């Protein structure tokens, strides 16, 4: 029925795959499996609407390319992931945001900012600066853990609400 094209973007190793698998398959993967591209599709219920999620798990940049453009350009909404113990992945959200806007050639793209690995202590990115980042872009912010499942439904189902509202 009603499909939602989602894309999971952000730096290498911030938990993009781990997040998606947890949502779709309901377990935590504790392994090193670099992604080229992988998609996941599951029927779920969101606020009483039966719908399909069509989800695209990307690679960290390593850089923009036409090939990467070719995969991402069909996405409807973007889950922009960083990890709260890795300041570089946080500094990188600006680039993706920007890249996503250029790929979709739009000044308003459905988006949500995700801060992953919330089970880990001694964070290097405070919730305040990140929450302030989401607000400066006018988009929501959700903290998550692929390991504990904290926030993971919130993050994804929220992006769907941003897609419904655009």
Ligand X SMILES: C[C@@H](OP(=O)(O)OP(=O)(O)OP(=O)(O)OC[C@H]1O[C@@H](n2cnc3c(=O)[nH]c(N)nc32)[C@H](O)[C@@H]1O)c1ccccc1[N+](=O)[O-]
User: Hey, what are 41's tokens?
Assistant: 């599709």
7 binds, among Mg ion, ligand X, ligand XY2, none (CB under 5 to 8 A by kind): none
Q: Which does 158 bind (CB under 5 to 8 A by kind): Mg ion, ligand X, ligand XY2, none?
A: none
Binding residues for ligand X (CB under 6 A): 12-18, 29-30, 32-35, 59-60, 116-117, 119-120, 145-147
Report residue 13 as tokens.
Answer: 């190793």
- What's the closest the beta carbon of residue 32 comes to ligand XY2, in angstroms? 3
Q: How far is the CB of 31 from ligand XY2 (least distance, A)?
A: 8
Q: How far is CA 119 from CA 15, 85, 97, 148, 160, in A?
A: 12, 11, 25, 7, 25
CA distance 113 to 141: 5
Report the residue number, 38 or 54, with the smaller CB distance to ligand XY2. 38
Contact letters for Mg ion, residues 3-42 (x by CB under 5 A): -------------xx-----------------x-------
Q: How far is the CB of 165 from ligand X (least distance, A)?
A: 27
Residue closer to ligand XY2, measured from CB, 31 or 105: 31
84/120 Cα distance (integer angstroms): 8
Cβ proximity of 120 and 147 under 8 Å: no
Q: Which two tokens stand for residue 86?
A: 């890795």
Cα–Cα–Cα angle for 28, 5, 72, rounded to 5 degrees: 90
**Binding site residues, Mg ion, CB under 5 A:** 16-17, 35
């Amino acid at each position: 029925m009603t499909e939602y094209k989602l894309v999971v973007v952000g730096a290498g190793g911030v938990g993009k795959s781990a997040l998606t698998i947890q949502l779709i398959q309901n377990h935590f993967v504790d392994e090193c499996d670099p992604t080229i591209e992988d998609s996941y599709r599951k029927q779920v219920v969101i606020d009483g609407e039966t719908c399909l999620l069509d989800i695209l798990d990307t690679a960290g940049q390593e850089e923009y390319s036409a090939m990467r453009d070719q995969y991402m350009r069909t996405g409807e909404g973007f889950l922009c992931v960083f990890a709260i113990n890795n300041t570089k992945s946080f500094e990188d959200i600006h680039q993706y945001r920007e890249q996503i806007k250029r790929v979709k050639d739009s000044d308003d793209v459905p988006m949500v900012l995700v801060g992953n690995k919330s089970d880990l202590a001694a964070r290097t990115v405070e919730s305040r600066q990140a929450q302030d980042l989401a607000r400066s872009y006018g988009i929501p912010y959700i903290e998550t853990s692929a390991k504990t499942r904290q926030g993971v439904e919130d993050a994804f189902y929220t992006l769907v609400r941003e897609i419904r509202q655009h």
